PDB file of C-alpha atoms in Angstrom:
ATOM      1  CA  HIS A  48      69.721 172.152 104.228  1.00 45.20           C
ATOM      2  CA  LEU A  49      72.636 170.969 106.499  1.00 42.47           C
ATOM      3  CA  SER A  50      71.269 173.275 109.270  1.00 43.99           C
ATOM      4  CA  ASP A  51      67.853 171.650 108.560  1.00 46.46           C
ATOM      5  CA  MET A  52      69.492 168.398 109.604  1.00 49.06           C
ATOM      6  CA  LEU A  53      71.025 169.455 112.464  1.00 49.69           C
ATOM      7  CA  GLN A  54      67.882 170.446 113.834  1.00 52.08           C
ATOM      8  CA  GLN A  55      65.805 167.465 112.885  1.00 49.79           C
ATOM      9  CA  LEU A  56      68.717 165.483 114.280  1.00 51.29           C
ATOM     10  CA  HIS A  57      68.993 167.789 117.773  1.00 50.50           C
ATOM     11  CA  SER A  58      65.280 167.240 117.965  1.00 51.30           C
ATOM     12  CA  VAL A  59      65.531 163.370 117.695  1.00 47.80           C
ATOM     13  CA  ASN A  60      68.834 162.865 119.757  1.00 49.12           C
ATOM     14  CA  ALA A  61      67.477 165.289 123.046  1.00 49.50           C
ATOM     15  CA  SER A  62      64.449 163.099 123.148  1.00 51.15           C
ATOM     16  CA  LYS A  63      66.936 160.203 124.273  1.00 50.32           C
ATOM     17  CA  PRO A  64      65.172 157.739 121.864  1.00 52.89           C
ATOM     18  CA  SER A  65      66.987 154.635 123.284  1.00 56.49           C
ATOM     19  CA  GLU A  66      66.298 155.469 127.256  1.00 53.88           C
ATOM     20  CA  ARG A  67      62.443 154.533 126.964  1.00 56.02           C
ATOM     21  CA  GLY A  68      60.732 151.956 129.250  1.00 59.22           C
ATOM     22  CA  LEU A  69      59.340 150.173 126.125  1.00 58.48           C
ATOM     23  CA  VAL A  70      61.000 150.708 122.743  1.00 62.06           C
ATOM     24  CA  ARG A  71      59.172 150.358 119.539  1.00 60.88           C
ATOM     25  CA  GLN A  72      61.410 150.730 116.916  1.00 57.72           C
ATOM     26  CA  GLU A  73      59.349 149.005 114.117  1.00 53.68           C
ATOM     27  CA  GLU A  74      56.346 151.680 114.683  1.00 52.92           C
ATOM     28  CA  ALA A  75      58.857 154.066 113.341  1.00 52.48           C
ATOM     29  CA  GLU A  76      59.305 152.803 109.926  1.00 52.35           C
ATOM     30  CA  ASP A  77      57.982 154.851 106.911  1.00 52.36           C
ATOM     31  CA  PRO A  78      58.673 153.189 103.344  1.00 53.37           C
ATOM     32  CA  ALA A  79      57.461 156.832 102.471  1.00 51.46           C
ATOM     33  CA  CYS A  80      60.380 158.150 102.883  1.00 52.45           C
ATOM     34  CA  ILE A  81      62.721 155.943 101.352  1.00 51.53           C
ATOM     35  CA  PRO A  82      65.778 157.826  99.328  1.00 53.46           C
ATOM     36  CA  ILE A  83      65.651 158.821  95.689  1.00 50.27           C
ATOM     37  CA  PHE A  84      69.129 158.427  95.364  1.00 50.75           C
ATOM     38  CA  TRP A  85      72.330 157.394  97.512  1.00 52.54           C
ATOM     39  CA  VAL A  86      75.713 156.557  96.923  1.00 52.09           C
ATOM     40  CA  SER A  87      76.107 152.732  95.958  1.00 54.58           C
ATOM     41  CA  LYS A  88      80.146 152.777  95.570  1.00 56.33           C
ATOM     42  CA  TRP A  89      83.087 154.569  95.848  1.00 55.43           C
ATOM     43  CA  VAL A  90      86.627 154.864  94.743  1.00 53.44           C
ATOM     44  CA  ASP A  91      89.108 157.476  96.613  1.00 53.62           C
ATOM     45  CA  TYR A  92      91.888 157.921  94.273  1.00 55.92           C
ATOM     46  CA  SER A  93      92.351 161.119  95.682  1.00 56.02           C
ATOM     47  CA  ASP A  94      96.170 160.482  95.988  1.00 57.21           C
ATOM     48  CA  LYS A  95      95.818 161.604  91.809  1.00 57.82           C
ATOM     49  CA  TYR A  96      92.440 162.293  90.640  1.00 55.55           C
ATOM     50  CA  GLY A  97      89.814 162.954  92.840  1.00 55.28           C
ATOM     51  CA  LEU A  98      86.679 160.441  94.108  1.00 56.42           C
ATOM     52  CA  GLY A  99      84.260 158.347  91.938  1.00 55.54           C
ATOM     53  CA  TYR A 100      81.233 157.663  93.049  1.00 53.97           C
ATOM     54  CA  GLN A 101      77.948 155.966  91.465  1.00 54.73           C
ATOM     55  CA  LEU A 102      74.647 156.595  92.852  1.00 57.10           C
ATOM     56  CA  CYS A 103      71.812 154.181  93.006  1.00 57.12           C
ATOM     57  CA  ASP A 104      69.953 155.487  90.174  1.00 58.29           C
ATOM     58  CA  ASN A 105      73.713 153.989  87.964  1.00 60.36           C
ATOM     59  CA  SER A 106      74.724 157.422  87.166  1.00 63.32           C
ATOM     60  CA  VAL A 107      78.678 158.535  87.883  1.00 63.32           C
ATOM     61  CA  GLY A 108      79.976 161.232  89.317  1.00 63.06           C
ATOM     62  CA  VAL A 109      83.706 162.395  90.083  1.00 64.47           C
ATOM     63  CA  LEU A 110      84.266 165.104  92.836  1.00 66.30           C
ATOM     64  CA  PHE A 111      88.249 165.729  91.311  1.00 68.29           C
ATOM     65  CA  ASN A 112      91.213 167.217  93.752  1.00 67.19           C
ATOM     66  CA  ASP A 113      90.472 170.410  91.954  1.00 64.75           C
ATOM     67  CA  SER A 114      87.561 171.065  93.509  1.00 63.62           C
ATOM     68  CA  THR A 115      85.477 170.811  89.823  1.00 62.14           C
ATOM     69  CA  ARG A 116      82.914 167.848  89.214  1.00 66.10           C
ATOM     70  CA  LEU A 117      81.838 166.014  86.555  1.00 66.68           C
ATOM     71  CA  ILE A 118      77.953 163.779  86.744  1.00 66.14           C
ATOM     72  CA  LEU A 119      77.525 161.352  83.864  1.00 67.32           C
ATOM     73  CA  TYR A 120      73.654 160.727  83.941  1.00 70.82           C
ATOM     74  CA  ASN A 121      72.296 157.169  83.361  1.00 72.67           C
ATOM     75  CA  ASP A 122      71.497 157.119  80.073  1.00 73.09           C
ATOM     76  CA  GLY A 123      75.488 157.308  79.714  1.00 72.58           C
ATOM     77  CA  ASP A 124      75.981 159.849  77.138  1.00 71.85           C
ATOM     78  CA  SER A 125      74.663 163.129  79.307  1.00 72.00           C
ATOM     79  CA  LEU A 126      76.862 165.091  80.791  1.00 72.24           C
ATOM     80  CA  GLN A 127      77.339 168.327  83.837  1.00 70.36           C
ATOM     81  CA  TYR A 128      80.486 169.805  84.296  1.00 74.12           C
ATOM     82  CA  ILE A 129      80.572 172.206  87.613  1.00 71.79           C
ATOM     83  CA  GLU A 130      83.439 174.637  87.912  1.00 72.61           C
ATOM     84  CA  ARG A 131      84.888 175.684  90.758  1.00 72.80           C
ATOM     85  CA  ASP A 132      82.670 178.657  91.213  1.00 73.14           C
ATOM     86  CA  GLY A 133      79.549 176.654  91.013  1.00 72.12           C
ATOM     87  CA  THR A 134      78.769 177.624  86.951  1.00 70.43           C
ATOM     88  CA  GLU A 135      77.116 174.418  85.688  1.00 71.11           C
ATOM     89  CA  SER A 136      76.879 173.241  81.801  1.00 69.81           C
ATOM     90  CA  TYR A 137      75.201 170.893  80.198  1.00 67.62           C
ATOM     91  CA  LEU A 138      77.583 168.574  77.523  1.00 68.93           C
ATOM     92  CA  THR A 139      77.719 165.101  75.977  1.00 66.46           C
ATOM     93  CA  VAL A 140      79.990 161.916  75.969  1.00 64.98           C
ATOM     94  CA  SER A 141      79.413 161.897  72.177  1.00 66.38           C
ATOM     95  CA  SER A 142      80.065 165.560  71.990  1.00 67.71           C
ATOM     96  CA  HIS A 143      82.374 167.313  74.356  1.00 69.21           C
ATOM     97  CA  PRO A 144      84.869 170.154  74.190  1.00 71.76           C
ATOM     98  CA  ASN A 145      88.230 169.042  73.849  1.00 70.85           C
ATOM     99  CA  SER A 146      89.178 170.741  76.898  1.00 70.68           C
ATOM    100  CA  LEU A 147      87.356 167.937  78.924  1.00 74.28           C
ATOM    101  CA  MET A 148      88.787 165.190  77.311  1.00 74.72           C
ATOM    102  CA  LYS A 149      90.960 164.322  79.999  1.00 76.56           C
ATOM    103  CA  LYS A 150      88.164 164.607  82.819  1.00 77.49           C
ATOM    104  CA  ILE A 151      85.835 162.902  80.992  1.00 75.75           C
ATOM    105  CA  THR A 152      88.556 160.080  80.456  1.00 76.84           C
ATOM    106  CA  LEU A 153      88.992 160.315  83.987  1.00 77.62           C
ATOM    107  CA  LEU A 154      85.273 159.471  84.595  1.00 76.66           C
ATOM    108  CA  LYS A 155      84.812 156.553  82.467  1.00 80.44           C
ATOM    109  CA  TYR A 156      88.101 154.930  83.956  1.00 81.45           C
ATOM    110  CA  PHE A 157      85.737 155.478  87.600  1.00 78.98           C
ATOM    111  CA  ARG A 158      83.004 154.292  85.900  1.00 77.54           C
ATOM    112  CA  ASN A 159      84.248 151.062  84.570  1.00 78.19           C
ATOM    113  CA  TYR A 160      85.820 150.430  88.093  1.00 75.67           C
ATOM    114  CA  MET A 161      82.813 150.926  90.043  1.00 74.55           C
ATOM    115  CA  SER A 162      80.598 148.928  87.313  1.00 74.24           C
ATOM    116  CA  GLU A 163      82.611 145.882  87.279  1.00 76.13           C
ATOM    117  CA  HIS A 164      84.395 145.379  90.651  1.00 78.26           C
ATOM    118  CA  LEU A 165      82.160 147.204  93.590  1.00 77.89           C
ATOM    119  CA  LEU A 166      79.047 145.693  95.068  1.00 75.89           C
ATOM    120  CA  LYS A 167      76.401 147.900  95.015  1.00 73.60           C
ATOM    121  CA  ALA A 168      74.769 149.406  98.146  1.00 74.50           C
ATOM    122  CA  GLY A 169      71.432 149.177  98.672  1.00 74.09           C
ATOM    123  CA  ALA A 170      70.553 146.936  95.898  1.00 72.18           C
ATOM    124  CA  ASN A 171      68.127 145.706  97.627  1.00 73.11           C
ATOM    125  CA  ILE A 172      66.164 149.083  97.969  1.00 72.95           C
ATOM    126  CA  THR A 173      63.479 150.264  95.509  1.00 73.89           C
ATOM    127  CA  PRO A 174      64.034 153.775  95.507  1.00 73.17           C
ATOM    128  CA  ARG A 175      61.403 156.662  95.855  1.00 71.93           C
ATOM    129  CA  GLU A 176      59.983 157.670  92.633  1.00 71.77           C
ATOM    130  CA  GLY A 177      61.638 160.684  91.932  1.00 71.69           C
ATOM    131  CA  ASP A 178      61.930 162.891  88.258  1.00 70.34           C
ATOM    132  CA  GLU A 179      63.812 162.268  85.713  1.00 69.78           C
ATOM    133  CA  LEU A 180      63.548 165.778  84.480  1.00 69.32           C
ATOM    134  CA  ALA A 181      64.998 167.031  87.827  1.00 69.16           C
ATOM    135  CA  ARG A 182      68.765 167.819  87.846  1.00 69.14           C
ATOM    136  CA  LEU A 183      70.732 165.154  89.701  1.00 68.58           C
ATOM    137  CA  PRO A 184      71.975 165.550  92.937  1.00 69.73           C
ATOM    138  CA  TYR A 185      76.095 165.283  93.045  1.00 72.68           C
ATOM    139  CA  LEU A 186      78.275 165.095  96.035  1.00 73.85           C
ATOM    140  CA  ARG A 187      79.271 168.875  97.518  1.00 76.45           C
ATOM    141  CA  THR A 188      81.773 166.966 100.206  1.00 78.24           C
ATOM    142  CA  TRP A 189      82.778 163.959 101.660  1.00 77.14           C
ATOM    143  CA  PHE A 190      85.511 163.280 104.344  1.00 73.47           C
ATOM    144  CA  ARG A 191      86.862 160.180 106.317  1.00 73.29           C
ATOM    145  CA  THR A 192      86.878 159.705 109.981  1.00 73.27           C
ATOM    146  CA  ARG A 193      88.535 156.547 111.667  1.00 77.54           C
ATOM    147  CA  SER A 194      84.997 154.563 111.692  1.00 80.37           C
ATOM    148  CA  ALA A 195      83.471 156.083 108.187  1.00 82.25           C
ATOM    149  CA  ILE A 196      82.900 157.960 105.276  1.00 83.18           C
ATOM    150  CA  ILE A 197      80.851 161.031 105.129  1.00 82.39           C
ATOM    151  CA  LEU A 198      78.870 161.442 101.988  1.00 83.01           C
ATOM    152  CA  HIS A 199      77.096 164.828 101.493  1.00 81.18           C
ATOM    153  CA  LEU A 200      74.526 165.500  98.360  1.00 82.96           C
ATOM    154  CA  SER A 201      73.606 168.567  97.009  1.00 82.13           C
ATOM    155  CA  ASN A 202      69.907 167.373  97.692  1.00 86.28           C
ATOM    156  CA  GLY A 203      70.971 167.904 101.506  1.00 85.02           C
ATOM    157  CA  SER A 204      71.408 164.065 102.230  1.00 80.94           C
ATOM    158  CA  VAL A 205      74.001 162.808 103.897  1.00 77.60           C
ATOM    159  CA  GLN A 206      75.152 159.374 104.000  1.00 77.80           C
ATOM    160  CA  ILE A 207      77.786 158.162 106.551  1.00 77.31           C
ATOM    161  CA  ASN A 208      79.077 154.505 105.571  1.00 79.26           C
ATOM    162  CA  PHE A 209      80.856 152.788 108.499  1.00 80.20           C
ATOM    163  CA  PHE A 210      84.232 150.823 107.679  1.00 81.71           C
ATOM    164  CA  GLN A 211      84.551 147.605 109.914  1.00 83.39           C
ATOM    165  CA  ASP A 212      81.031 146.102 110.519  1.00 84.11           C
ATOM    166  CA  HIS A 213      79.662 147.747 106.808  1.00 87.15           C
ATOM    167  CA  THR A 214      76.731 149.429 108.397  1.00 84.96           C
ATOM    168  CA  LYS A 215      75.493 152.905 106.701  1.00 85.18           C
ATOM    169  CA  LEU A 216      73.269 155.850 107.478  1.00 85.48           C
ATOM    170  CA  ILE A 217      71.403 157.463 104.390  1.00 84.90           C
ATOM    171  CA  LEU A 218      70.068 160.718 106.182  1.00 86.08           C
ATOM    172  CA  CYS A 219      67.754 163.093 104.039  1.00 85.08           C
ATOM    173  CA  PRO A 220      66.525 166.330 106.103  1.00 85.23           C
ATOM    174  CA  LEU A 221      63.739 166.824 102.925  1.00 87.27           C
ATOM    175  CA  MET A 222      62.080 163.526 103.983  1.00 88.21           C
ATOM    176  CA  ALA A 223      63.206 164.426 107.756  1.00 89.82           C
ATOM    177  CA  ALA A 224      64.206 160.538 107.899  1.00 90.63           C
ATOM    178  CA  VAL A 225      67.099 157.933 108.556  1.00 90.46           C
ATOM    179  CA  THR A 226      68.159 154.926 106.406  1.00 90.67           C
ATOM    180  CA  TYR A 227      69.758 152.721 108.233  1.00 92.23           C
ATOM    181  CA  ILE A 228      71.415 149.385 106.421  1.00 94.67           C
ATOM    182  CA  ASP A 229      72.559 146.775 109.208  1.00 90.66           C
ATOM    183  CA  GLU A 230      75.517 144.397 109.189  1.00 94.45           C
ATOM    184  CA  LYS A 231      73.463 141.750 107.235  1.00 95.94           C
ATOM    185  CA  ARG A 232      71.989 144.258 104.592  1.00 96.63           C
ATOM    186  CA  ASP A 233      68.549 144.568 106.045  1.00 92.72           C
ATOM    187  CA  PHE A 234      67.377 147.893 105.461  1.00 96.25           C
ATOM    188  CA  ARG A 235      65.105 149.985 107.443  1.00 99.20           C
ATOM    189  CA  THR A 236      63.737 154.026 106.865  1.00 95.88           C
ATOM    190  CA  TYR A 237      62.691 155.721 109.423  1.00 96.44           C
ATOM    191  CA  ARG A 238      61.035 158.958 110.236  1.00 96.65           C
ATOM    192  CA  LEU A 239      62.633 160.672 112.987  1.00 98.77           C
ATOM    193  CA  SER A 240      59.859 162.203 114.316  1.00 98.12           C
ATOM    194  CA  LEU A 241      58.421 158.951 114.782  1.00 97.11           C
ATOM    195  CA  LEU A 242      61.602 157.762 116.729  1.00 98.59           C
ATOM    196  CA  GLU A 243      61.211 160.292 118.906  1.00 98.17           C
ATOM    197  CA  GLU A 244      57.875 159.244 119.797  1.00 97.33           C
ATOM    198  CA  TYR A 245      58.091 155.640 119.697  1.00101.04           C
ATOM    199  CA  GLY A 246      61.986 155.121 120.350  1.00102.46           C
ATOM    200  CA  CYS A 247      64.787 153.042 119.023  1.00102.14           C
ATOM    201  CA  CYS A 248      67.710 150.698 119.918  1.00102.98           C
ATOM    202  CA  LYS A 249      70.906 151.688 121.176  1.00102.58           C
ATOM    203  CA  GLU A 250      72.854 150.497 118.125  1.00101.01           C
ATOM    204  CA  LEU A 251      70.600 153.112 115.789  1.00 96.68           C
ATOM    205  CA  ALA A 252      70.766 156.332 118.776  1.00 98.58           C
ATOM    206  CA  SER A 253      74.508 155.979 118.992  1.00103.23           C
ATOM    207  CA  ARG A 254      75.077 156.284 114.964  1.00102.94           C
ATOM    208  CA  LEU A 255      72.162 159.164 115.075  1.00105.98           C
ATOM    209  CA  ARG A 256      74.681 160.817 117.613  1.00104.42           C
ATOM    210  CA  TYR A 257      77.422 160.299 115.509  1.00103.03           C
ATOM    211  CA  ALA A 258      75.421 161.432 112.756  1.00101.68           C
ATOM    212  CA  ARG A 259      74.831 164.636 114.727  1.00101.40           C
ATOM    213  CA  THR A 260      78.663 165.148 114.907  1.00101.91           C
ATOM    214  CA  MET A 261      78.924 164.388 111.383  1.00107.60           C
ATOM    215  CA  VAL A 262      76.927 166.890 110.336  1.00106.63           C
ATOM    216  CA  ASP A 263      78.402 169.643 112.316  1.00106.36           C
ATOM    217  CA  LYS A 264      81.497 168.919 111.002  1.00103.85           C
ATOM    218  CA  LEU A 265      79.703 169.520 107.728  1.00104.28           C
ATOM    219  CA  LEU A 266      78.368 172.351 108.521  1.00101.30           C
ATOM    220  CA  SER A 267      81.774 174.038 109.382  1.00100.16           C
TER     221      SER A 267
END
């Protein structure tokens, strides 16, 4: 879905939405486009183990330095392991192969840390209704730049968390939408096609330009 996201972002950015004679950013808000999932907390322990994260439903995952992934569902027991070659297995904390003892122990340390020590990004957002029977998205990749951490989920979502002002973007190619969390923690969800038509403020337009560069870097 990165290509889809890029087509969506080229289209919006090409419209020059902050260069309208009358910007009506409010008219681009669409609560029906609120995401189901986003990254609420993360821990970069890539000096030793990898990057752990919490999604907004309280599930946790870790992308290990070896490019494998473990996901703990929010029942607190259902695990999914994703091998480097992409093979997926379902397991549980209560009944796991001993081969995964170490990685499960690491997950529980990331989980306990995030749970008790970090703020929950978007704790004021009621997520869109999804399906408890569908698989969780997992973190496909991430990187950091001078200004942000970039987080790409397996459902196509790209999340950009800016370090200095704590502003964040959640971009979804399925809803063709952007959630913007500002410096006060207020949030709004915009349909990209409505931004084409109505415009937006310079702050959001700049962040969407940045987003396009990030998605380009992800596709590469």
